[model samples]
Target: RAWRPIAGGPGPLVLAVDFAATGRPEAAFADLVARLDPGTEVWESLQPPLGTETGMVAEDYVTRWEEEVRASGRRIGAVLGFSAGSAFAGELAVRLARSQPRSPRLVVFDPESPTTSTLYYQFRKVVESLAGVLGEQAAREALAEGTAAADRIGDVEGLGAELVRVFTAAGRAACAAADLDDEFADELTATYRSFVSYLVAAAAVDHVKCWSGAVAVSSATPTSGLNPLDPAARAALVERELTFDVHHADLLRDPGVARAVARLLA
Candidate 1:
């Protein structure tokens, strides 16, 4: 599902867009949604139908997504995006303003304008997840090879596909190590491919292109995993930024975040 309700109410709809590989309920906005002012409805964005190949474009993908939100037929009072999800949030906000009397309240948490290193981190995370099956030595080799691939590939799409190729090689070896079925290995790798495609598409979006007056929520300690481009540059994407002296993971569930949201929208 592209969007899932986190809170139900008689008030206007507020959508939260957070990146979750499999769309779990604990996305960044889940707790904040519950803590918001009474009667406000909230929905979270999940994996919106992304293609498997390297040609995924943000401009094209977001148009379809904006229409999907339009079909919801609800009055949206606010929209929030987290990490890569912020890209879609900004795009969604632009579309909403075209017909609505006023634009929705826009906010982005740790907005990421991803670079090639971001793609490398994605590949690393996937490989590391299989370390238990592939064993330490082979996993290290996979990481080394993945890094080399990142070094050689300059463009986002090329790097994304190259990483998948390297991952497939490692994944096949993992099948042998774990004695798992070959078909199962393909399924696992397909998800990795899908994610790479999604990452590229999301990164392709210039979130600040059309959206403005966006409130930014950032972590005190930057998340270097998907990090690239000096954070100050990324910060310019939003109108006003609110910095919380907390790590990235706790930023969502933290009570301070709720207070900030209250202060911003109130």
Candidate 2:
């Protein structure tokens, strides 16, 4: 079902695609709907099954979504995607741009891991750096604490979080010893943010898609999205409410994002 009120004839449609899962579809959809014009009709695509890999998984989701969008017989205004959701958005945009006389504007915010192994490899590097920063003793303590926590919690994401915290903390400690310049700090921060932001265009589908909208990608998660971790704070960046903090919160904190979005619909 569509997310909100589209009475008196369905208005211009803006479909927000979901992430790789369905655990929090409404949170992102509701945020966009609240920002959209009352006249804007909104729909969300079906959530793929868990462990759904990219390529096939993404194509299937968008194919189904395209059928629905066309079947809906509604005038689609544009598409606004967020987080991992942007993968499909990127693919959809690319296909439409090639096939349609006039394609829908796709504005994706804070995309997911742009490359399949990019984030993983970078994580590996950071983890090693983190071990060094923790000074062997602290590193050992963290590995024990994290692996134990993961065993108890049985949440992979939780494990990723612990590892991130460990790496980030260690990086800050290393920076202290490195005595980096303020300019160097800025450049370093930019590289990190850029790496994070590339999620909007990561994955094979992302590599192919071409968007024609104001895509202001940013870093979400605890990092730029309000990382309590010193790394995120030291970076001193704030993302729009685009990325829902699935790790903790739900309610959208940036209504202004919605307000800004309303104008786009019009």
Score every model by TM-score: 0.86, 0.49
Tens digit of lDDT per residue, candidate 1, span 1-266? 46788788865788887665544323367767667776777888766443433455786667655666778778778888877777778778877877689878888887765668888976787778778767888889999999999889999878987888888888788788764578778777777777777778877777558445677787765453123336676556557777788777667777888888987776
lDDT score for candidate 1 against the true structure: 0.73
Q: How many residue pairs clash in each candidate?
A: 0, 5
The TM-score measured for candidate 2 stands at 0.49
lDDT of 1 at 155: 90
Q: How far out, in Å, is residue 147 in model 2?
A: 7.5
In candidate 1, which residue ranges exceed 4 Å CA deviation?
Answer: 22-27, 49-55, 179-184, 223-235
Q: Residue 153 deviation, candidate 1, in Å?
A: 1.1
lDDT of 2: 0.47
Candidate 2 C-alpha lDDT tens digits along 1-266: 31333222334556666442223322565655664556656666544332232234335556766766666566555766665556666566656655566667676555442432334434444444546434666556545654454456443334444444544454455467564444544444434333332332234354222433335334345532123335443233222224343332233325655665565455
